[PDB]
Amino acid sequence: SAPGTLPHFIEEPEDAYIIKSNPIALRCKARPAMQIFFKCNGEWVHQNEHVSEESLDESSGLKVREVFINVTRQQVEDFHGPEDYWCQCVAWSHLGTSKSRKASVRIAYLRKNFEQDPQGREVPIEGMIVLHCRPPEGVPAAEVEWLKNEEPIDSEQ
Amino acid sequence: CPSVCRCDRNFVYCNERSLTSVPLGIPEGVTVLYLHNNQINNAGFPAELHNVQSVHTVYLYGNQLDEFPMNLPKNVRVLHLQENNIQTISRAALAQLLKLEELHLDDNSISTVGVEDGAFREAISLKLLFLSKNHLSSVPVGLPVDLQELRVDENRIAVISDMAFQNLTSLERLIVDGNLLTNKGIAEGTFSHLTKLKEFSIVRNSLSHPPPDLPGTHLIRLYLQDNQINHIPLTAFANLRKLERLDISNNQLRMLTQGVFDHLSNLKQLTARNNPWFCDCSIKWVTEWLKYIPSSLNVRGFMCQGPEQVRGMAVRELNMNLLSCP
Amino acid sequence: RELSCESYPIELRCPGTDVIMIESANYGRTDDKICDSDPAQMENIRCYLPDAYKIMSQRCNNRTQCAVVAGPDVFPDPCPGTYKYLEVQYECVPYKVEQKVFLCPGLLKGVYQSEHLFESDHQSGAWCKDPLQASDKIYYMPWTPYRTDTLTEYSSKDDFIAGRPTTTYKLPHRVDGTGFVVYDGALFFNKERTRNIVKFDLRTRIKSGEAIIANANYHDTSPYRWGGKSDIDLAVDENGLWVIYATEQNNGKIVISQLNPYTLRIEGTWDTAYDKRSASNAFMICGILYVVKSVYEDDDNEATGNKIDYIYNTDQSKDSLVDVPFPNSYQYIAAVDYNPRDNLLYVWNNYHVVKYSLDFGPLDG
Amino acid sequence: LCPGLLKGVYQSEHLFESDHQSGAWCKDPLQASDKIYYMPWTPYRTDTLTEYSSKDDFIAGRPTTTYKLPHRVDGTGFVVYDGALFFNKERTRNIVKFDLRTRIKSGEAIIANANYHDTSPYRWGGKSDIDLAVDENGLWVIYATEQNNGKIVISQLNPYTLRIEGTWDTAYDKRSASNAFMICGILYVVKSVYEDDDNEATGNKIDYIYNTDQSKDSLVDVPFPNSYQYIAAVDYNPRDNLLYVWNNYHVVKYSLDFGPLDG
Amino acid sequence: DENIDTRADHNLIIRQARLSDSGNYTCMAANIVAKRRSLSATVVVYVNGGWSSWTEWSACNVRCGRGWQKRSRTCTNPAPLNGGAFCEGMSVQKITCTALC
Ligand SMILES: *[C@@H]1O[C@H](CO)[C@@H](O)[C@H](O)[C@H]1NC(C)=O
Ligand SMILES: *[C@@H]1O[C@H](CO)[C@@H](O)[C@H](O)[C@H]1NC(C)=O
Ligand SMILES: *[C@@H]1O[C@H](CO)[C@@H](O)[C@H](O)[C@H]1NC(C)=O
Numbered sequence A: 001s002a003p004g005t006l007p008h009f010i011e012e013p014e015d016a017y018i019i020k021s022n023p024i025a026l027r028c029k030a031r032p033a034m035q036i037f038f039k040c041n042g043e044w045v046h047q048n049e050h051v052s053e054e055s056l057d058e059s060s061g062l063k064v065r066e067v068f069i070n071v072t073r074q075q076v077e078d079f080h081g082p083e084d085y086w087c088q089c090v091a092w093s094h095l096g097t098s099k100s101r102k103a104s105v106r107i108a109y110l111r112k113n114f115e116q117d118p119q120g121r122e123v124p125i126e127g128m129i130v131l132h133c134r135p136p137e138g139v140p141a142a143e144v145e146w147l148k149n150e151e152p153i154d155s156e157q
Numbered sequence B: 001c002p003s004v005c006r007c008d009r010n011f012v013y014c015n016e017r018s019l020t021s022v023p024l025g026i027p028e029g030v031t032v033l034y035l036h037n038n039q040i041n042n043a044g045f046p047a048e049l050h051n052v053q054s055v056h057t058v059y060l061y062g063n064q065l066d067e068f069p070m071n072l073p074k075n076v077r078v079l080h081l082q083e084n085n086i087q088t089i090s091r092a093a094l095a096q097l098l099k100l101e102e103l104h105l106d107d108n109s110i111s112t113v114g115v116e117d118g119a120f121r122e123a124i125s126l127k128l129l130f131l132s133k134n135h136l137s138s139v140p141v142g143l144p145v146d147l148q149e150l151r152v153d154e155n156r157i158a159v160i161s162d163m164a165f166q167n168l169t170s171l172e173r174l175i176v177d178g179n180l181l182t183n184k185g186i187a188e189g190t191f192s193h194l195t196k197l198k199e200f201s202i203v204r205n206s207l208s209h210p211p212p213d214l215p216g217t218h219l220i221r222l223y224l225q226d227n228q229i230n231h232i233p234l235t236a237f238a239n240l241r242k243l244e245r246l247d248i249s250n251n252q253l254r255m256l257t258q259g260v261f262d263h264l265s266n267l268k269q270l271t272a273r274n275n276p277w278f279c280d281c282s283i284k285w286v287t288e289w290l291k292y293i294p295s296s297l298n299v300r301g302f303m304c305q306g307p308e309q310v311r312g313m314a315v316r317e318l319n320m321n322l323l324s325c326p
Numbered sequence C: 001r002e003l004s005c006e007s008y009p010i011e012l013r014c015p016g017t018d019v020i021m022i023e024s025a026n027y028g029r030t031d032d033k034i035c036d037s038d039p040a041q042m043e044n045i046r047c048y049l050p051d052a053y054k055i056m057s058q059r060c061n062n063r064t065q066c067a068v069v070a071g072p073d074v075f076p077d078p079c080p081g082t083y084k085y086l087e088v089q090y091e092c093v094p095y096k097v098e099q100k101v102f103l104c105p106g107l108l109k110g111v112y113q114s115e116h117l118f119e120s121d122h123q124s125g126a127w128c129k130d131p132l133q134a135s136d137k138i139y140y141m142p143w144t145p146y147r148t149d150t151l152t153e154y155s156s157k158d159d160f161i162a163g164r165p166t167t168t169y170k171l172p173h174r175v176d177g178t179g180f181v182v183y184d185g186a187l188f189f190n191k192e193r194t195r196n197i198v199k200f201d202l203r204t205r206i207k208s209g210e211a212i213i214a215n216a217n218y219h220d221t222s223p224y225r226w227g228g229k230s231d232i233d234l235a236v237d238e239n240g241l242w243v244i245y246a247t248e249q250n251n252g253k254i255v256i257s258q259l260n261p262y263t264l265r266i267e268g269t270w271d272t273a274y275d276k277r278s279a280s281n282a283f284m285i286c287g288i289l290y291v292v293k294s295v296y297e298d299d300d301n302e303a304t305g306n307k308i309d310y311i312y313n314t315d316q317s318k319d320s321l322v323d324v325p326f327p328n329s330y331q332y333i334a335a336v337d338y339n340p341r342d343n344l345l346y347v348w349n350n351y352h353v354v355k356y357s358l359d360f361g362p363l364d365g
Numbered sequence D: 001l002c003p004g005l006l007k008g009v010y011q012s013e014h015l016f017e018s019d020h021q022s023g024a025w026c027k028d029p030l031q032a033s034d035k036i037y038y039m040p041w042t043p044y045r046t047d048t049l050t051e052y053s054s055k056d057d058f059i060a061g062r063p064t065t066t067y068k069l070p071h072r073v074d075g076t077g078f079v080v081y082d083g084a085l086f087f088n089k090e091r092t093r094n095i096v097k098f099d100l101r102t103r104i105k106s107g108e109a110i111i112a113n114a115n116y117h118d119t120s121p122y123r124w125g126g127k128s129d130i131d132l133a134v135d136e137n138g139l140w141v142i143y144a145t146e147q148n149n150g151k152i153v154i155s156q157l158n159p160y161t162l163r164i165e166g167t168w169d170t171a172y173d174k175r176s177a178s179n180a181f182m183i184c185g186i187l188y189v190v191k192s193v194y195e196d197d198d199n200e201a202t203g204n205k206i207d208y209i210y211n212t213d214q215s216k217d218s219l220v221d222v223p224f225p226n227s228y229q230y231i232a233a234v235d236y237n238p239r240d241n242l243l244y245v246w247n248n249y250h251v252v253k254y255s256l257d258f259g260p261l262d263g
Numbered sequence E: 001d002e003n004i005d006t007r008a009d010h011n012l013i014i015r016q017a018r019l020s021d022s023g024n025y026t027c028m029a030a031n032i033v034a035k036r037r038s039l040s041a042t043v044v045v046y047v048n049g050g051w052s053s054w055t056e057w058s059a060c061n062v063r064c065g066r067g068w069q070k071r072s073r074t075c076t077n078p079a080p081l082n083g084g085a086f087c088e089g090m091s092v093q094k095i096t097c098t099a100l101c
């Protein structure tokens, strides 16, 4: 009586970043699902590495499955492939299979020295000026915020 | 010749040109068609493409397909449909390409349920099938009778039925490695009806012992690595009188029973690095067998792990006549 | 001694006309209080790079002044998320240089048959010797379509003919074509169904890197006249490591690019006028490309071949049409590689494993 | 002093299983002491020597003192001669003399035309281009030159002046050999089968000898013991007439048999 | 064009990548002495992938019992351009159908 369809992803894996050698795991949620596995960097991840949790959500009628996989610093630093350490999620149903987002695990860092500091200018009352800023190298890309006299400025204001 | 696509002599180069469909202007003299690394969807296939009889090899890898394509060149022999999203295989599609001999379907999302009942049997001339790196849970039923090589490795196959390898007498190479396969998964003598089989491989699986009732009539190469093989029964390697290459390295073996390799007369190479070999009295026959062995046979990997007194030592040579064992 | 933190270029200079000589070099972290950065990046004080000496010797040695940018352009990253530095210990010695081995023999005048080892079980395959390491080791890889995944090592020439191997390497990926080469104890090969070059250290038996050759045609798209997934061909000469391939931008014509054996990056690209499928094979000598045009089994109303008909210089960026007779006893030419240490060609021609002798011009300009 | 010509090499003692796959260990034959000098081999990082008071302390892992060497060491050719350490300096064809008592470098000798830094090492490599030996005749240097076409070149070195007091060229290739040792001025070349060489099955025996006094060579067949496969270093001690062999991660001692077949 | 403007501190501002598309932009300084050309900047405008409208459901392959129905969703509205990001999610849709006999 229940409707039968391909697996639909709820919690797709999001890009992870390793900080101070603390291994951060990847989340995966799909419905309807009976088997959920990870395909990291082209090849399947071993069954033992997977931790399944067949928790039935109230909001949805069909069977929900949640699988978590730990990714260590040693795994990323010893991987010498062409692209960034990526992972994908494959879910099994009675009709077929479905792939998720490619979540890329990277080594998080940030530099002290700014690439280009803003330069001071003398401008008339009607004149226009642009203040340039190049943030330091780091993964992920740095979020630039402007401050007028050590207090933030609102662009929409 | 097309405008967007640049043809060169007896070849057509429509590769890496951001194309979503096959170009119209295709000559009737072309033999090889390149359409790989594009964005060609399963909907962008004209009927006129089927009419180009001269084409024998088509390359469509790294595209954005959902199903096996329709209206492909009639008299095609070799097809390259890999690194894309194929999930459905229809009987009508394979019925068009009768002359198809070599088929590669690597890295696709092919599932057991997605393939139509006896869809591969429609390609009567098929000999090479590559269902590698797909989303397979078991070996499909309706396989071609005159198939020579079935490469169904690197999936999620846990169970194999006896009827999966029916009428596949003509098969020579079977590669089922990198799967969730156990001894409970393999049916009572499923592989027995494959007389012409020469090479067999179940590496990186979960076998507690080698699969019983294996064909010996033509088998030359047998590979059983990274499995959890605790012990090998005596009957398992008998009636394989044609075997030359055997590998059992990266397994959970401690000791072997005397005369387990007595029927492997044609054996040229045996590999047994990384194994927890417990060297006691059960290895006395191993050392003696290694001494009277001919130059024809190379046996490597036999190294002790227990006890601490003989730890790391090679089973090739004994000291003080294996202590007080005989 | 000289020291410089990450992304900071280093400078080396000897007094007068004296030459720089590297003694010890390391790119990583041994001490945490020398450089000044974030304390999180300084937590790991055990980063090492052995290849540091090899890089410095190729650039600073046998020169008066030296400037090497301590970054990813010249040095590969050993430990990620760690602020590295370059520690170099150098001595000033006379301006003398070592001859013959590094030096160019000249312009190719004629190719002749030299040695015939044996007749292999495979029609196509590739064999070579490491020109950097002073050893009589022979590396053998007989090409089997959709099945090539092993590299065989032989102790000597006598063992290679007799078929007595030392060790066999189990590669992490399938190899495409007969283009492989060995550079300083590391194997460089084209990975199947990809425009990528894989670096595999034979000593450690692990993959060290994978480089993407931009716009390169792969997997029977633009191979040599015999096909067999020969799309990407690797070469070794006096100038260094090279990549012979083809792009659709050059309309199937041969594109030659110099590759760094440590950073695995393109250090220059050159486009030729010769079509790769029309070519039988190619080899590099002094940064000069030599295109082989040979005759094959099954050639309808054909006799034209067994010649070097095209040459391309990288330094001058100019091409010329030559006519150097090439030996082709058996028809199926599979692989042609040049070894700068012995100045001989490593050929595989229709099951036959052969070595070819070379003759050179009095000048090269 | 000479016991005679070597007949057979046999297993004697097994001390322990070290954490490193390669290295060397030896005792000073000149000084009448039970001191053991330990050397773990680490690529591009070898710079310390460990001294042990006795055999019991060496097995138990109880060290007396550790010496901080002035330069990085290349290969497993470590040798001790009358309270002074003789080692090969990294990326150079230079023996370095270091007095253990004063803890200072006393000299540095250049071994002429010698191949160095993985150019001509043993079968397993590991920068074993230059190997030092001690026997009844004195201090010796086992190496290879391009003049001899990679073949083994043996030279007697003075432990005081640090100069070559004679040079001999052999017919055996250094890379084809596993290790070598000197007894009564006679060189013994060991040929063995290593790990990850799963193609190999051949017997591990001594197949070459070279006399310095006679300047003549012969092809022998003395069986060499190999419980493990990674034979790192083989050194002879003239005081106890035993071999200081390092095979794989393990550290062993080998007993020696002698014959009176000498002029 | 209102989309492009020149600033007093020598800057070229583009609001929308539609009214001023890709190209090899080069900055040039002029003086009474002479003129000087700068290194050209490669400004490339990319179009990100967007899914196209759903198709019709196919007929049930099996006559009696459990059947199949398909619906395709291609990445052509808009189709990725100049190295734009590919479409996110699944391309095919399948539902079980029961045909009365
Ligand atoms: C591995 O993942 C599980 C959750 O699936 C977590 O509880 C466990 O702590 C992780 N392992 C480590 C070492 O953190
Ligand atoms: C398959 O083999 C069976 C016997 O096991 C035989 O009865 C059947 O006819 C064969 N199928 C075909 C198409 O011949
Ligand atoms: C350059 O310097 C290196 C460093 O030792 C040396 O080996 C080489 O012989 C010198 N000469 C040339 C031409 O490279």
Ligand SMILES: *[C@@H]1O[C@H](CO)[C@@H](O)[C@H](O)[C@H]1NC(C)=O
Binding pocket: E023, E024, E040, E042
């Ligand atoms: C800049 O782009 C133009 C085409 O718009 C091209 O012709 C020119 O060569 C390019 N210049 C560079 C340096 O890429």
Ligand SMILES: [Ca+2]
Binding pocket: C233, C234, C235, C281, C282, C283, C335, C336, C337, C338
């Ligand atoms: Ca070549």
Ligand SMILES: [Ca+2]
Binding pocket: D131, D132, D179, D180, D181, D233, D234, D235
């Ligand atoms: Ca020695």
Ligand code: NA
Binding pocket: C126, C178, C179, C180, C181, C233, C234, C235, C335, C336, C337
């Ligand atoms: Na090659």
Ligand code: NA
Binding pocket: D024, D076, D077, D078, D079, D131, D132, D133, D235
């Ligand atoms: Na020594």
